[PDB]
Design a protein around this ligand. Structure first.
Ligand SMILES: OCc1ccc(-n2cnc3ccccc32)cc1
Length: 185
């Protein structure tokens, strides 16, 4: 792919974070804490899952960013509508305003309804995410495997401003403590 030139500087929005997340001073890294991180509750925070949004909102154009997932066992990445549900249980699907992929139990899947099996020969350490708002496209790239395509959501009906979306996952196993990191341009 030749999407690198649409690179955008993404930062995390603390106010949307699950109350157990720890976001770095530069707002470029996030990990699961051991405990509640001593913040007040609000209507924006994701309650059920270790999720957080980027601060940036996109309503036009082409955007590209990269995320480091080194040594994690579980995570979700992509974009979502600014107005997605924050409280209670929900599925990651385009019907609910999410365009995502994930790792879970040694398999990679795209967040369609129902979910789609991905075919990855080289487990990624960094994922590239490309959004074309006008075209209705969200694509995922394997940066570890020379940028190979992972998955393309096409004919997307965004129906609102988009925000970068992250889930660090739970750490029941003790093998999933590592952070998600936004990689430099
Ligand atoms: O809660 C204990 C605790 C402390 C530090 C970290 N940690 C910070 N950056 C990391 C990068 C990779 C793996 C673990 C990392 C995790 C867990």
């Amino acid at each position: 792919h030749h999407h690198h030139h649409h690179m955008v500087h993404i930062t995390l929005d603390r106010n949307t974070a699950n109350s157990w997340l720890i976001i770095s001073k530069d707002r470029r890294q996030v990990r699961m804490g051991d405990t509640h991180q001593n913040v007040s509750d609000n209507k924006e925070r994701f309650s059920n899952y270790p999720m957080v949004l980027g601060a940036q909102r996109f309503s036009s154009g082409k955007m590209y960013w990269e995320v480091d997932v080194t040594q994690k066992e579980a995570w979700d990445l992509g974009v979502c509508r600014d107005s997605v549900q924050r409280k209670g249980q929900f599925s990651l699907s385009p019907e609910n305003g999410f365009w995502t992929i994930w790792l879970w139990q040694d398999s990679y899947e795209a967040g369609t309804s129902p979910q789609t099996t991905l075919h990855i020969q080289v487990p990624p350490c960094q994922i590239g995410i490309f959004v074309d708002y006008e075209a209705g496209v969200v694509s995922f790239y394997n940066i570890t495997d020379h940028g190979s395509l992972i998955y393309t959501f096409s004919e997307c009906v965004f129906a609102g401003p988009l925000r970068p979306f992250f889930n660090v996952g739970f750490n029941y196993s003790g093998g999933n403590a590592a952070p998600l990191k936004l990689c430099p341009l």
